[PDB]
């Protein structure tokens, strides 16, 4: 889709792997991105990773092996802020 937003959740001890808790395309994606800023949640532009997550990991699912390293990196960039 033209717009994609993937919301990832990780909490040490609770989520063994990062969890996709919310997703959106097009209007809903734009709403997620705007509300994220409003609520001070880090938003990273990563076209390939967002696109592949959207295609492969549905809302409510843990990420799979192919995504472990790139998403771990994403989280550390976000957490480093």
């Amino acid at each position: 889709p033209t717009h994609i937003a993937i919301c990832l959740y990780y909490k040490l001890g609770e989520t063994p792997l990062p969890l996709v808790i919310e997703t959106g395309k097009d209007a809903k994606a734009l709403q997620i991105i705007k509300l994220a800023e409003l609520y001070d949640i880090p938003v990273i532009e990563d076209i390939p990773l967002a696109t592949s997550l959207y295609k492969n990991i549905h809302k409510g699912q843990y990420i799979t092996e192919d995504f472990f390293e790139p998403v771990a990196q994403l989280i550390r960039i976000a957490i480093d802020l």
Partner: peptide
């Protein structure tokens, strides 16, 4: 019209990735 859970899910998120 957004679902009632959208805002809570965003606020809970560790990071959001976009295209």
């Amino acid at each position: 019209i957004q679902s009632g859970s959208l805002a809570n899910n965003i606020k809970k998120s560790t990071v959001i990735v976009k295209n």
